[model samples]
Target: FVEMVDNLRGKSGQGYYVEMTVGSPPQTLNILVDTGSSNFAVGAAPHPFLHRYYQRQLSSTYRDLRKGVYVPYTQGKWEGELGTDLVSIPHGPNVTVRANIAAITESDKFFINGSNWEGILGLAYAEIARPDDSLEPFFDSLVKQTHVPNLFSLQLCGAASVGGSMIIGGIDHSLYTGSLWYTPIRREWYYEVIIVRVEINGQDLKMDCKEYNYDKSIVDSGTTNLRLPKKVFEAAVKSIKAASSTEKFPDGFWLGEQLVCWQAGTTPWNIFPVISLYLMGEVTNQSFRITILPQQYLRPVEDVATSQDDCYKFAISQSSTGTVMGAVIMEGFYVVFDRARKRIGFAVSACHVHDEFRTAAVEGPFVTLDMEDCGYN
Candidate 1:
């Protein structure tokens, strides 16, 4: 019980994009979500990057703070500029946390043909540590200042799915299908659990407990991947290899196959293996997917041997930041992480789940103005 309490009482908060206006009523400019940094920044007016999107969606709450303060840029070097200011999150209760806001009224990262959106919301750990290693996050800061327990949960609803939401305060009960389960988080506050069992289409893949702990993971909407330790990752890959049809995802491997996305209900591929995560003594099952990008996509590693087994020459050491739940898996449902009760929740509605496939221009990876409108993109 004491250990569960400690695990439930994770000592941290959170950290973790945009579009333009057009005949399409364009995506709101400059609203990014960066979990690597905990600062909340919106698109400032008169930004060189500001297009009709920012200028039009400009709300009464939007105000200029030319004299406001700023924080140091956290990630070594990125495209945007950083600063701080006292701003209110739209639905927040008279909340006022000094934010490390970005000055982006324009620009972005990734495949260029993407959307024409503006900046992002930085949710990474504070500027002091890297995203993969922080103790306190921006959400933690909000909890510190507002005493709100600070929750962040996300659900993916694709071109299908129904009403969903992304919340920062207490969770909406109707969103979840059942009870809340508790688990311990590693020092990084990331939920790292061992899969005592795994099966896909009623077939066993492999369950390696090499470095797994049942229920050692925290729910992370700020991340793109359902990261498992090496053993679990290998097990999942083995399953994908078995079930995957080369016709669907050319490579049939975990790292190099180009994902062939489907509208929420279209794909016949049962990619998700019924992964059962055991927390304490309770067994909870989750369906997770995998993506395949080439080693060429990675930065060269410090250690390299000619053997094909080690020839990849690179791994997270050189590319850790990109691994978090990026725009791939988050496309459809609404997700929630509740600190107040220490539970996780999900809603099967259409919220913005990050996937590079949809609305191609811009992978559509940021938050929405309204919960239901999450499907707008």
Candidate 2:
């Protein structure tokens, strides 16, 4: 069993980092927990021509896979060479795999190393991995060798620095309220799901009312804001603008070339509409409603474009894909990624589950804990 507290680093508390040790001597490194992409690569900031320079010599059992990679993303691409070595998570046993596909990055456009994290840990399926997509992800390999369950839980505590937690191998019963709500994974590549409907202030967006089909959505922790299709984004923003008595955004504002903000104390985000997503199982036809409160969507924006103004940081932006649920929507929930079951579970986060973790045993192949009325038959 491995348990790590979340580090709310980066601008606007956008990232969740975990402490990890790589190599035989166990060189400690901070890693970004990303579910949108797959590739366990270390950042190369000190130089470009150096593959394993700084700590490559420190590791007694470093094996250079020596494979080059050009993994691309929506924002920036990661360029690096591959290598293999033993990796360990605190509270968890040593995970050594010959199938280890590690990355030694030479350059990055996303500023990988400057902000505390030394590497990016991908938690999605292996089908999206680079180099023929044949490599097993770091977490997948770790679960195979250990007695831990093929399950992991995430409890994001908004912008607070200390409440977030990550538990591998078992669920932290105390980190959530009610029962865990489970939904089937629509696609194996990402934590993709089919959206049956989307509502704003109880009014349906009617995205499906059009000719749209196969409405896919991804739950990505790597992203800080909610991204939707061009039409959907416009509709959401339009509805929000229409809600204000002044027929404008909260702070008597109109769309501008730059970021905008409103005083939460004076304007109050609850005046804005509540957004809800209805996700349905492709096979089971079962469904669940994932509601996003106004407070969750209206966070403090931190980019230079939006700095000094605390507008809706989790604003809906246009995305090339169908939709994406980022940290904004995930902050208040306890999320479960069940790779073995090919499903995801959601419940209100029990942030500071100190009471439950006290008795939560961290060993076993899989855990069968107390669960109730979660719409699962």
Candidate 3:
């Protein structure tokens, strides 16, 4: 889950940046975070983010963190450096950290167009570099040297009632109304969850209808859109209010002949599952505790024509329970991926509100961290 404020860096990359500081008087730089990969990277001059937003609190340390810290990613592509500095998450600890960050010292790097973000903060799963077998892992390098071992949290607000957190430490109690759930994490670098088909209106289709399965599914909060196969989505709508498409973005059913507000002649309809997210275990309250936005994306034609040119497709089979749980779905809850604790928890309350944020204000609801006046220099 992401935080409410757009702590993003540039405006066109599929990445997000975090600000840090180092040295005597402090210097600040915004770096991206990527969970699909391990090994963090920072932006450097003679690079793309030269015109991006840079927080002003760490000017002194920013100068120091940029010393002889150069390292290259695999295949001799883009490059950066390794340096020690201070890092802090909004709702986290005051950390003094040092690691390899991206400092594009060359001119052959590639950049992709993102909906709304800058560079990346890659949180891929792997050791940062080839180890002598005597060095610590990247995370341990920080946790072992720091005072607090509690993890940091990420709370994002996509809309008014939709904001959530990625809790690092034991989850805060205020986030949920029910109990947490459980499922053994597979032995893999990145934790992958099956995208079971979401039930739109009860008994629509079985969960496996979507293509993203135990093998193909992945859970990433860094992504903003809730993507699914077109056919599976249409079948889901067939279970709910079946209507033709008219609007955009908020794409789904309309005031339709299929959606009957009156069930057995009652004005208010019997709500089954507008959409459901089934995790490994059960909710403590025996019900869903978190919030979700309404359905988006449905086709006007009965079937969107398939072609040989497409990589992703809409299938003909029925789906049961599957979803991406992307950045859109990660809003308004406190989520914990405590693989070390062998449990996953979601707090339904205490999320961020979109209206509550001030645009371009380097502040956070976890405002106690002093983002308005950070001083890690």
Best candidate according to lDDT: 2
Off by more than 4 A, model 3: 1-17, 22-25, 52-91, 106-119, 127-138, 159-168, 195-197, 207-214, 229-273, 282-291, 295-323, 352-377
Q: Taking the tens digit of each residue's C-alpha lDDT, what string does model 1 give over 140-179?
A: 6677778665666543332211222345565555444433
Per-residue lDDT for 306-337 in model 2, tens only?
Answer: 34444544456666555778877677578888
The lDDT of model 2 is 0.62
| Strongest candidate by TM-score | 2
TM-score of each: 0.52, 0.81, 0.56
Kindly report the root-mean-square deviation of model 2 from the true structure over all alpha carbons. Answer: 7.5
RMSD of each: 14.3, 7.5, 13.1
In candidate 1, which residue ranges exceed 4 Å CA deviation? Answer: 1-30, 34-37, 41-82, 91-96, 102-117, 124-138, 160-164, 188-197, 202-204, 211-232, 244-249, 252-254, 257-334, 340-377
The per-residue C-alpha lDDT of model 2 at residue 180 equals 70
Candidate 3, residue 360: CA error in Å? 28
Model 1's lDDT to the true fold?
0.35
What is candidate 3's lDDT per residue for 1-377, written digit by digit as tens? 23323343422113344554433344454444444445444445534435442232344444334434333434444554444444455533455655444344442343343223223554434433322222233455555677544344444443312223344444556555454444323333554443333444333365342343423334455554454444554555555434223222122222222211212223111232334444333222122223342321211122224422212111112223233455544444445665454444554434433232221111111111211111111
Error of 1 at 217 (Å): 6.4
